[PDB]
Design a protein around this ligand. Sequence first.
Ligand code: PLX
Ligand code: PEE
Ligand code: NDP
Ligand code: MF8
Ligand code: SF4
Ligand code: SF4
Ligand code: ZN
Lengths: 48, 97, 341, 208, 96, 376, 114, 124, 112, 176
Amino acid sequence: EDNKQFFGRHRWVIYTTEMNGRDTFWDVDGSMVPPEWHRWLHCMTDDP
Amino acid sequence: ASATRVIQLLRNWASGRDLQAKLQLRYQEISKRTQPPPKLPVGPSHKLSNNYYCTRDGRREAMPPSIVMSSQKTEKKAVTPAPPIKRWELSKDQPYL
Amino acid sequence: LHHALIPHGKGGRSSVSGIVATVFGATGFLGRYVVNHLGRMGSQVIVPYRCEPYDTMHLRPMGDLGQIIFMEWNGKDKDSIRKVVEHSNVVINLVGREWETKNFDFEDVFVKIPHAIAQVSKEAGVEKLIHISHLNADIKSPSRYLRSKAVGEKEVRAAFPEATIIKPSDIFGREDRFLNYFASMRWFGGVPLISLGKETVKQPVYIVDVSKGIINAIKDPDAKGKTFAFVGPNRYLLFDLVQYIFAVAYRPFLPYPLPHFAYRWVGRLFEVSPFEPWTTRDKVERVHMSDMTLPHLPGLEDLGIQATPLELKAIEVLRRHRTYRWLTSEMEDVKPAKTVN
Amino acid sequence: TRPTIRPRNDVVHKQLSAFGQYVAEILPKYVQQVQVSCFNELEIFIHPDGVIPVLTFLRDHTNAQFKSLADLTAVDVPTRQNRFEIVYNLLSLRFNSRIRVKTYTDELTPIESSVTVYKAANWYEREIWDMFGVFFANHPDLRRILTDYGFEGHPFRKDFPLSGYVELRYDDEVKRVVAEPVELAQEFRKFDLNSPWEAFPAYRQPPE
Amino acid sequence: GVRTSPTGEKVTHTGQAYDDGDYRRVRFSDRQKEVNENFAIDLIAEQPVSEVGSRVISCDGGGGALGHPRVYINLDKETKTGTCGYCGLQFRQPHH
Amino acid sequence: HPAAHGVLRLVMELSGEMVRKCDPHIGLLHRGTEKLIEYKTYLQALPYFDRLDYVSMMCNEQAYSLAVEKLLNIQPPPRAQWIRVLFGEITRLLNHIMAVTTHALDIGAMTPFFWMFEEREKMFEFYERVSGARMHAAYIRPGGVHQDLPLGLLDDIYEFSKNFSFRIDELEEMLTNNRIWRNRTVDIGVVTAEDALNYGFSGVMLRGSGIQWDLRKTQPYDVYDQVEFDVPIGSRGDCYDRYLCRVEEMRQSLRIISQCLNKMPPGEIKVDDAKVSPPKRAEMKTSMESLIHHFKLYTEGYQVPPGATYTAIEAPKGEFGVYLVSDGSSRPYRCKIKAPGFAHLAGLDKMSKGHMLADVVAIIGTQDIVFGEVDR
Amino acid sequence: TSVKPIFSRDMNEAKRRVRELYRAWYREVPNTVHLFQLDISVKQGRDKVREMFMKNAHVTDPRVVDLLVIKGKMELEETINVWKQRTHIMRFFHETEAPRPTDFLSKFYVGHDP
Amino acid sequence: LIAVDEKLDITTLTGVPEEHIKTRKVRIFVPARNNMQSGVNNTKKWKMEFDTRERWENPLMGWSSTADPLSNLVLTFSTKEDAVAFAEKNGWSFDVEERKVPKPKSKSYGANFSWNKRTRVSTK
Amino acid sequence: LKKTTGLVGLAVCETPHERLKILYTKILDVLGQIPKNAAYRKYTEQITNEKLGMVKAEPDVKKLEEQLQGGQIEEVILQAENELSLARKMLRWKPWEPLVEEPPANQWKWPI
Amino acid sequence: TYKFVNMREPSMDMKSVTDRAAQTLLWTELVRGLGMTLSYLFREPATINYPFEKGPLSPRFRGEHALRRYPSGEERCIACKLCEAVCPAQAITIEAEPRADGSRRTTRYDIDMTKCIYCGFCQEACPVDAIVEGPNFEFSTETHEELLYNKEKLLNNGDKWEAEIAANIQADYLYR
Ligand SMILES: CCCCCCCCCCCCCCCCC[C@@H](O)O[C@H](CO[C@H](O)CCCCCCCCCCCCCCC)COP(=O)(O)OCC[N+](C)(C)C
Ligand SMILES: CCCCCCCC/C=C\CCCCCCCC(=O)OC[C@H](COP(=O)(O)OCCN)OC(=O)CCCCCCC/C=C\CCCCCCCC
Ligand SMILES: NC(=O)C1=CN([C@@H]2O[C@H](COP(=O)(O)OP(=O)(O)OC[C@H]3O[C@@H](n4cnc5c(N)ncnc54)[C@H](OP(=O)(O)O)[C@@H]3O)[C@@H](O)[C@H]2O)C=CC1
Ligand SMILES: CN(C)C(=N)NC(=N)N
Ligand code: SF4
Ligand code: SF4
Ligand SMILES: [Zn+2]
């Protein structure tokens, strides 16, 4: 998180290099995040 | 935001308007995503007395349309659907662009 | 019959025809037509594919939701064959290539694969097996294609005694080889023919007629272990047939006699292409060979299908090969070719 | 102050009633009935052949300058002998008012086209024809506007099924889109919603 | 707990399981059958029984406005526990 | 065609590049909205209006709600009416942004398109906050609105309105006095006042032609009579005058938005009549009568007294009207939708006399046709 | 009396209108085949026009005849202006419909249809 | 300007297929009162509904499919004569059932306490 | 005097009063061929005489527009021409005759 | 009130005539447009770095559907069919029967996501907050069939998104 960026880009995520059994070094999906961090990233709330 | 002082002046003279005065991006000036609980009002018909649905029944006050004239059944002045509409007044805030 | 196999509806796209068919080699001409007919009926279709899934995209709109299921199979993999034929009561065999590749030959694609499919189909207890052979299936034909076709037909009959073996003569249609091969000889100057094509007699059969015969063979109760010969109504000499093809395509026709050994050498040259060859020696042999007459075998009229003449459907195929000058020309302009009856 | 109930406008009701009496007196040959709904909407029911005279009067009269054709539709009522009910909505900008004119017709009886009075009537009557089947006699170009080319039947009739009779799909055999009889994967589930208890006694129909 | 059909196919909590001779099992080949492991009946049976000393009790599912509409259970039948049917919760008077 | 606004088969008879006749073929987006409305309940017919003019969604919803409330003889609460007006003006800003930017894109300019569509993205954020859907809110319902505003929506709307006049000025700096745009849009598709009135044009078309007529000023609805704004009037009746009128309408909509933000009243957001609007969740889960009314409203719906009405509003594209006929049941008997673009596209042939292909594209842009509402 | 006729009043003039429409369609099949690049013959097109005309041979009401010829003229003018595509012209032929049997035994075999 | 003696027929204009014109036998009737409720507001207007056709189960999702376009079509008419006229002019077959109106019943509260008759009630 | 009327296609008329008088006189002449008992004739003749009185009484254009309450003078002239055309058509139509035909038994009943 | 958008006549003094002539020859307004475009170039872009940055949403957002449970684990749905009756698109199919313990539950609960219009009427008509429109919106598919959810799929979605769904319900339910 970086509050100095404009709203929309003030929270970002770097995805894991390996999830379950897929090698996600390059192919990263927008739904890999768990539901709680998904909510925090989409800014439905304020507390992580 | 974050911009070089040279770039700020370059944009300001190129655009002709102070861009930093009204930025197009949101920087912490928006409302917090988490807000305190609200309390909506109840309404006018949440009284516990003198409140019978008979006296506030909107649907039941509708009536079949009035039959002005049906074929089955001095000098009157000619009439109009309504008095003629008044001429619009020219705007005082900005009469001409 | 199982409760889920009882027919229902008015035979539409969303109906239930009670047919569960595994269509081997459905990613082709006859395969796509048969799959389209089954989907139009409203049947359960299983399409085993070994190519890219992109090459099987045109089969998706041919059936309703949950009717077309795509599975991956290998030709020499009995486990995959069993996996794809486990839950189907009809198995249709259309696997075949006109050329020999590095991994698969005429023996492999016409004897080993059909026999394996028939053997595994019997193990899974499928009710009906349909197998496509060729009309000129001779045990000692000059063409290894026809030799392997006959050997594989015998092997399939041995493995699955309750089979229906279809023997079409020659398929002509939009994606066919026959008319396109004959009409693609514009580029190579003239048209080479063996003995000017005066010794070869052919009666091609329409693709839609073949597909409808395959479909009705499934629904026919007393065609369980039979052999059918699908041929057209009119027999044409090869020279007259090629002349009519070029007349309908509105292209200059310059036929010349090419000796058999020279034609064999030319076919040998054209089969070195790593991709799909334009022509091969066995293709030349099949073109030269006349269509055998087998009156004792049943046919389309016996199944319940009236044969479609070439003249009616020759313009669907050959209109693409015309130029802008003759694109708008009608079908009635070109007179029908002379027949041999 | 009765916040739930909508307010009423006696003055506008009286004005509309007076104007309805006025138009009925002016045009007694065609005007059969005049009604004023409780929400101040004047409504005139006339003979079908009076469309052109009544509309021309309401458009060009000095005391009724209804120069804008708001809408033109039809209502299918199967029980009535003249099922189709042509409805004209007119707007008078000079007097800031609206009016409605209603005529009746059936499948075979033609209604005179009002394109010579209002130009929007061109497309509005094309839509009416394409949707219901009402034929307009003198029309510059009468043909389908909304339905598919070669579509059979008029969709907005109350006797026309919701899903139609045919559907479309692509048939690889003929390399073109084909039309086949409709066959839904899931049938439209019709709901019986009407309660068996009378809601509004004010609209109770006499048992004769 | 998910139960296994005689054909090895997982059985849902509503008793759904394709027959051995049903062709529709072909759709699960090279794919999976979507079955949730948790069973509501098993979980609610594992839940205990509340014991309150009143003939009439109220259940709203817990949470207030976030639960089910509040209903009243009459615990006069001593041979069985009164079960709020919105949430399937049992109540019973103390026998002691 | 990219300039066909998605679905329009314009059969043009060109003589070189001039236009001899235009025969617009519509119905490529005809679904059967009126038939489906006949088969659906009053509550279930609202999203159909939400999808008619998919650029003025709150405006279509407001028109339908006004029709149903007039038939029901009820009155929405003042706070609900003020929220309706505020979101109607926000939707008008959205629609005018879309129209001007699409017209500029058809002409050949795209930077204003991108800027004003970023602004549209912010307004869609407002929509998603208030309702939960970015485009099709289904928020305005007969008897009021669905839910009350969140506790920061007014502040964020104030910020957006404060930072939008500069965007309008930037848009004007690129097209208003540009000679290329002036040549493209001046004296193109001139329509006289009498022709516009007869052909049934409404809204910006009439104002450009010079007609001093606005529904919000002449037949006020909701609390539009309680706000002050100016109605732009054209002088020449061409594309340039209509563009100027639309920009000035954007500015006046900003005025109305400011007035609504300053004058927002407190109270409930739907009619206090549980036989028309469903009760709150707490009342439904604690009160027997409230639960019964919730059940009946969401299963059968509310009955509407028999009768026919025609209500019209000043939607951003013109006069949007609904002619609703009820037979006393819970589902409408008939519903005719008078879209503003229908008459305009009917009159497209007249406006394109003597013009060329580019001028025809410009005339389509200035007519601002949405084929969802055109075809219904 | 007092019944408004759409056109042509009595039946003879309606038959005249029918013959005019049939002539107009007959002199259009070759153009339809040429323009749309149909695979059918001109004779097949004329036969189909004759069939579509003959399926209303039992009409005895002049107003219905007038409405039928009006709709036929609309469809004719749609074909000339190439507003229709090859799709609709071939929809006139039902080239993909399965043959529904009309005998009682086959109808009993296939399903519950009357 | 013609006579009106001849029957009206709009089958050739409605666009309905010949199958659904010839093989359809609609039913004209006043709907039976829902026996679960004592309201009679749904027994006022005549109805016209079509014969039930085949419904099967979808191979996927097990939904109920249909091939009858007019399965859900129910028309409401003010009177039997109007319903019959509409059916005749649209060419369908029809079967008409007359209205079943309850006969008057003589109710008396005093009969619940009869001196000698059997109508006396044993409980309230 | 005014440069433009503010309406496209509505040209400024340099002789308002003469045109208004001529149009109203023509309208009154047309109304003389309509039967005396006709309800249409009395109303339009009354309103025309009321409007023809104002033009003959006020020479000022702006005050005339204010008193007529029908918009600008060009709009008034257009309304007069439309009224003249309507009067001619009505003389052709003759709608003062009795009703052509009553509707069927229950034609306008609703709901039904 | 009304205003004239374009009714301002130009002046005719020599200074203004020369200024207009200079504008006609020397493309002053064109240079002004260039300057505006250059300023927008030198500004900062408003593009987020998807998928590493997600756009803002609200607790009222309506996305993928789900079926919830009570904290005890029991299903919330009681097969009241209000969602089925109120669904505008008729995308919900419900079939029920008494359970082994007599509970009123569902045997078939199907939502056709290709037929749903995502309007939220089902979650507002649910008397026990069983069916909800969860926050998930990225559930695209390569095949049509997988977009026909059933009871098992909806229960799996509810179990996966239970925490976020509960948080959204807590944040929003006071407005309902
Ligand atoms: C005249 C000769 C021909 C001229 C025209 C052709 C010139 C070709 C020159 C070489 C082109 C370079 C291409 C290689 C770029 C690979 C970049 C790297 O990222 O590839 C990744 C790995 O991809 C594959 O593993 C390999 C890609 C191709 C690698 C090179 C292939 C062989 C190159 C030499 C072939 C022979 C060249 C001579 C004949 C043409 C794919 O990343 P991706 O997953 O998507 O991104 C996910 C989304 N992110 C960004 C958010 C993370
Ligand atoms: C090295 C490269 C330099 C690049 C310069 C970039 C300039 C800015 C780039 C943006 C311009 C690109 C878009 C321009 C397209 C439109 C331009 C344009 O229209 O100009 C034409 C415009 C006229 O068109 P309209 O006004 O529209 O006519 C209709 C009137 N209603 O003006 C012109 O004709 C331009 C002519 C050049 C002006 C020359 C003036 C100089 C004359 C004085 C020289 C005197 C020399 C001799 C005197 C010596 C005395 C001792
Ligand atoms: N058309 C003709 O000239 C006539 C053909 N026949 C016979 O009818 C059948 C169908 O003919 P047709 O459609 O023209 O042929 P195609 O070449 O067009 O189709 C053959 C099909 O079999 C598949 N296939 C080929 N080789 C293998 C392999 N080694 N393993 C697995 N699958 C394979 C292909 O799939 P993929 O693309 O994935 O390799 C393709 O789907 C053949 O048996 C043919 O002999 C009979 C008479 C005339
Ligand atoms: C789809 N809509 C509304 C468009 N304007 N489209 C377009 N391509 N310009
Ligand atoms: S969101 Fe609306 S359309 Fe979708 S399932 Fe729920 S009620 Fe039906
Ligand atoms: S509204 Fe809720 S409780 Fe009722 S059937 Fe639907 S999901 Fe179940
Ligand atoms: Zn409980």
